[model samples]
Target chain A: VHLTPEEKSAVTALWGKVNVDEVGGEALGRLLVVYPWTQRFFESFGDLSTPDAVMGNPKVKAHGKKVLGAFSDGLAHLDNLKGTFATLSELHCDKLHVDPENFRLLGNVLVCVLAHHFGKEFTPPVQAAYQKVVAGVANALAHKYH
Target chain B: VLSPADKTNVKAAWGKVGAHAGEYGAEALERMFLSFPTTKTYFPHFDLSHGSAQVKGHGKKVADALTNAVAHVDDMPNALSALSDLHAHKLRVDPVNFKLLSHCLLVTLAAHLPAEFTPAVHASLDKFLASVSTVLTSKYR
Candidate 1:
């Protein structure tokens, strides 16, 4: 729940870059590439198969950036993550059928995409920081998944 | 450029604001639509009557974008460029509506963070938001 000052600084530096739709689109496309099954959640770009088609879709990219925006909310509201992720919990768990495992898979793939873009700052501490943050976001939704 | 102190204060104030950013943004949007019917030209089909679902949803999306955009205010040019893509190129929005949204958003933020939204906060936020309006209009030119 508590991110060290180092974690905050390292993560903050890379915040705007990844949250951009261009970068987020690439990251989302990679998630589908690495775990093709996850595309079911995206009816918009779910049918696209080719590398260019998957990533080149603007709506998919815009939606990807919007998803990444929630992570920004998570970062901002670490002090009150419950309230921050409340909508996510209700939507993913209550509104639709989904597996908890896919959340973990998605997070891992996202981290891989993040590392590709962030490069050197993608060190162990930052990696751990992202893991912690991603878990914090995912765990809240999982709690209400029943 | 926002002074480091202003950014710090604004961030802190926003921290205290919690999830209300969307609510505030939605209300401001309502105010804008009511105050300036010409802006309605952007959304021809959607119902914009009081308390309509679409209005609320549209309001939330606007607020979400602004709230997310605030963090990277220093990168304003790029931060808002994505939004301009559809508005400036595809939809062909009137640049004046962007300014209207800024005006309404500031009103909403002022209401939400009264104590922290000091004179300086108001001035600085307006300055940054005005630039945002300009930045969003670039594709038009």
Candidate 2:
């Protein structure tokens, strides 16, 4: 599905409003705080503490920076997402043994963070647009999931 | 319309409720079957009795999803869609069962959350769970 001019601008505007570091950092922080099972998957941040602490760790910080950062980049390039998303799915499924179920958590956290970040600016249309984006990302990551 | 305070207390309460998600998950499933026996039709293999292997495993799954769902409240509508597709398409679980399960889940959360599960907490959780159930059951429509 193509983003209308309005949809494209709205989605683009979201990125303009906040950078990836803050968005991804807050999302990952919330995920770890709420779901400890997720931390176990992070060897580097396995002993994650407060949200602030995880964001402060260089190892943890990079993962957020790249992974979450890739999302906006991913949105801009959903058509070409296969190879990269394939690697991501492969890593999660093959190396991480990531639970097939937790994929939902990733999608969930992404939307939650976006909403929290955007606040009232996060309208229904914006939610729909992000939902499309997150679905694409999750589907790619979940491709190799068992 | 959840207040900032409502969000805090609810999350903290969930922090406790979700600590042993497996237990609450199991209890919720058992309670679901109890409140709405028809839902048991989806799980024919399970003994359908409390404390059984079936209850434990299924309960954990329910709790696990709900736990995951709670963390992603803002993303709940999107998040629940996966399970929604599964129950709606793959499992072909009766759609009404999702609504019933949500009811049972609220009961389960209230039972365990203690004083933290106050009216406001109940309102917030119920509203969120209702949204989850709405999406989960939407496939039926």
Candidate 3:
């Protein structure tokens, strides 16, 4: 919960290189492949019948970017996570009835994507910091739930 | 990879969880589905809602698997060989799901058996579950 200045620097330095355009789709695609049940939520995204279709679907890619964009926004507002995610929390929990747990799942999947792409740059220190960031974001996103 | 003391604590704690292994297993699985919905993907054929008989039955199977692992702590890979094959080859399950389920299992145990769930016991069970997960996912390349 507490990110030291060094940890913040570690996350910021690595995040500078993250291509939000690409990472979200890659993470979302992997999420569907590894956890097929999520397709229930994404049926509207189209052609999620198979791993191949999930990876290649245009809507999947577009939504992935949107998901990643939210992550980017979270990164931008590390100090005010609850405010940053308030609307999202209502949209996901109130209107959409998404299980709050999915936010944590997606946060972890996003971390996996960063590790895969950043490899050597994603040192344990950076990862620890990034984890705090996502955990905060996840908690913020679940605030609408009791 | 559990220390001898760790193994002793795990066995002791499991003893307290005896007879209720199936119940605990079902509770853990249910909690995992509610708390980590994506995990239900692996069991798409089964009903995932509360009080589903299929879920309870599968939970018994899971408890039986863990009981077997507890019996052969020193030979985990051999004890769970068939399951390892099923998960790694046929099921093609991602290794991360094991951690998610293990976490839910620990919480279920702690909630139901609060007196028996001491810090030492918790650590021991955590190690035991990690070892079990490693064996289950060993065949993955």
Candidate 4:
């Protein structure tokens, strides 16, 4: 794609900031902070014991119930949380190609949610694998749309 | 060994993965570099190590951002649109280059995933990747 001067400047500036270690920390934290509900969602849905148990087993369901309750309570104070899902839907609509972006986001989100819900004790390799999956998906999308 | 059920689960999981390709930005190019080491060899003037490090660091950052952005997938288009526009207008990285990088990524994933990977998963990822490339490339025109 041919970049205009302004777009190039924006990309370069963003890229520089994104590449910095300190900025990465802040960006990651902002992302996590903005979407705490995702952590609750994963905590509720993470049990894969019964694979057939829809959203996992009864324990999972109970977890979901409690989390949702908490989410509702939190949403009372933070109304923006209620519209997270809606915002995502709107973002997809604004883009022309809905295919790759959706999956890349899905994979990254799943991994992050799992990490948040499961705690940081999970293997670094697992986290690495999650990063690989995200990279695979991201590059694929960039190739398609860029 | 993935069971029949596991295979099904993987496919379902992949479908979910397929939905958020747009959020990926320059990091995709970085993956392509990893997937196709030979691609870098072709660009002799470019410092592959520097590029690779940049790519790796960027990939990690993007992954972190994406993980946090999961709940907001529905609102991702604006961010994605901004990303696409940036690439199209600023970075000016060719879309065809993305295709080359994606090809290497898929080949690498197939080889890396080995036992867990399936024909269906490969095909789904291929299709999904291709579609995302098309969207970002289209922004150039």
| Candidate 2 chain A weakest ten by summed lDDT | A115-124
How would you encode candidate 2's per-residue C-alpha lDDT over A1-146 as one tens digit per residue?
Answer: 35567766787777787777866766666556545568877865555665446656666666777778777667677565666678778888888888756665666556556654554466445655665666667777778766
The digit string of per-residue lDDT tens for model 4 on A1-146 reads: 22344433433332232223322232223222222333333344444332233232444445434423432232233223324334433443465435444444444433333333333232233344434434443443344333
Candidate 2 displacement at residue A98 in angstroms: 2.1
**Tens digit of per-residue lDDT, candidate 1, span A1-146:** 76788877777777756646665676666566545677777775555675466767777788778877776677787767777777787787777677877766566556555654554455445665776777677776577666
Report lDDT per candidate. 0.67, 0.66, 0.78, 0.42
DockQ of each: 0.01, 0.04, 0.03, 0.02
- Expressed as tens digits, the lDDT of each residue in B1-141 for candidate 3 is 688988898888888889999987987787677656688888989987778999999999999999999988899889899999999899998999999888667666655664665435655786798899999999988
Candidates ranked by TM-score: 3, 2, 1, 4
Q: TM-score per candidate, in order?
A: 0.47, 0.51, 0.55, 0.34
Clash count, candidate 3? 0
lDDT of 4: 0.42
Q: Give the alpha carbon lDDT tens digit for every residue of B33-127 in model 2.
A: 65345777888887975569978887788777877776776676687788888877888876566656665555555545545544345446655
The residue ranges of model 3 lying beyond 4 angstroms of the native Cα positions read B1-141
Query: Which 10-residue window in model 4 chain A sums to the lowest lDDT?
Result: A23-32
lDDT by residue for model 4 over B102-141, one digit each (tens)?
A: 5444433433343433334443454545545655566787
Per-model fnat list: 0.00, 0.00, 0.00, 0.00
Pick the winner on DockQ between candidates 1 and 2: 2
Best by DockQ: 2
What is the DockQ ranking, best to worst?
Answer: 2, 3, 4, 1
Compute the lDDT of residue A31 as modeled in candidate 1: 61
